[PDB]
Amino acid sequence: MTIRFADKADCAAITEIYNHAVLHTAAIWNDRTVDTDNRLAWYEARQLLGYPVLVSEENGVVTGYASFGDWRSFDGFRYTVEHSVYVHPAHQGKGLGRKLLSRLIDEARRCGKHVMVAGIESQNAASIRLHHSLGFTVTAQMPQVGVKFGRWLDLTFMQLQLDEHAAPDA
Amino acid sequence: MTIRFADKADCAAITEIYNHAVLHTAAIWNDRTVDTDNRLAWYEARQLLGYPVLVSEENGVVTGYASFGDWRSFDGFRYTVEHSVYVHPAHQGKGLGRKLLSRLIDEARRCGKHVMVAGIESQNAASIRLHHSLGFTVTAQMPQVGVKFGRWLDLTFMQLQLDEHAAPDA
Numbered sequence: 001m002t003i004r005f006a007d008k009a010d011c012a013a014i015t016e017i018y019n020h021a022v023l024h025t026a027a028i029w030n031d032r033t034v035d036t037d038n039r040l041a042w043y044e045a046r047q048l049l050g051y052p053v054l055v056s057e058e059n060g061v062v063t064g065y066a067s068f069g070d071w072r073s074f075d076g077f078r079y080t081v082e083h084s085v086y087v088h089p090a091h092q093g094k095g096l097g098r099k100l101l102s103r104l105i106d107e108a109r110r111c112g113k114h115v116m117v118a119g120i121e122s123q124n125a126a127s128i129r130l131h132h133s134l135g136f137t138v139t140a141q142m143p144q145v146g147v148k149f150g151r152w153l154d155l156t157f158m159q160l161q162l163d164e165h166a167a168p169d170a
Numbered sequence: 171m172t173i174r175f176a177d178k179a180d181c182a183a184i185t186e187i188y189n190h191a192v193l194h195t196a197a198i199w200n201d202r203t204v205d206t207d208n209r210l211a212w213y214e215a216r217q218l219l220g221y222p223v224l225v226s227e228e229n230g231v232v233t234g235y236a237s238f239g240d241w242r243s244f245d246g247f248r249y250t251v252e253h254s255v256y257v258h259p260a261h262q263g264k265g266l267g268r269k270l271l272s273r274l275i276d277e278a279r280r281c282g283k284h285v286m287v288a289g290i291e292s293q294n295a296a297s298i299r300l301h302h303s304l305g306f307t308v309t310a311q312m313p314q315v316g317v318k319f320g321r322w323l324d325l326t327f328m329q330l331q332l333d334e335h336a337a338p339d340a
Binding site for chain 1: 198199200201202241244245246247248249250284285287309310311312313314315316317318319320321322323327329331336337338339340
């Protein structure tokens with residue numbers, strides 16, 4: 001297994017993993033599938049922001065991917081990012097999520113980001129454990145803020161502070 | 171005092187109040203001022219979404235304004251809105267914030283929204299009290315996620331569930 005930066009050529013595999021998350025999981029709270037061109041667009045936008053898109057690979061097959069984006073739109077949140085880590089359903093129970101997330105955190109420090117936030121369905125105990133093991137702490141428990149598959153969903157935020165330096169000048 | 175829906179003609183007054191919040195408060199975590207055309211643009215966009223823009227008025231003067239927008243971008247959050255209520259600095263200690271917020275909540279029910287979220291600087295005890303008095307509860311305490319005026323800022327989320335009905339079908 002290796003983890004590397006994604007290329008344009010990885011976007012078809014990313015699309016499959018994204019669409020799986022969308023249709024068959026509560027790991028992303030979006031409802032419709034996209035095409036490869038859409039994930040290329042998304043990929044380019046991330047590149048434009050200087051944000052990382054990582055893939056895990058095994059025997060030349062993309063087994064997972066990870067990225068982060070801005071957590072919120074306003075200026076004041078510009079050092080807080082929110083991650084997305086998705087593992088292909090043929091490839092979990094192999095610790096790829098944690099390895100992807102660890103690498104992502106490193107990239108977040110290179111971008112000077114101050115906090116990484118994870119948005120986790122509150123009932124996902126496995127994800128909560130994985131995040132605790134990387135030093136994340138639970139800072140939100142928000143009932144019924146989401147909706148999917150005919151039910152209201154509860155959201156947990158967890159976060160990890162990435163440095164103890166001062167904020168930028170006024 | 172009255173509260174009414176805003177018009178295009180209220181956008182210059184809204185702009186003043188917005189810019190005050192931006193420059194002189196930690197009530198909004200944005201850093202630069204905008205012009206009236208920008209708030210007209212923002213106003214129209216809200217109208218396009220069917221979302222309310224309210225103003226408080228006294229003797230023909232706009233003393234405050236309130237609106238809500240989508241809390242997060244993803245489909246699954248489409249019944250969760252986040253409010254913004256700003257009172258003109260010549261007009262607080264008059265209970266306008268709470269009155270604006272109460273009216274806003276009513277408008278949120280008319281839009282079928284299921285949860286309203288407030289994002290509050292954690293040290294703003296007065297805002298926390300005002301929200302508790304309308305049935306909001308604290309569901310997030312997130313240190314150093316924001317930045318303004320040379321310091322890291324802590325964010326509190328509070329929320330109010332607006333109905334106890336079922337979610338939309340799958």
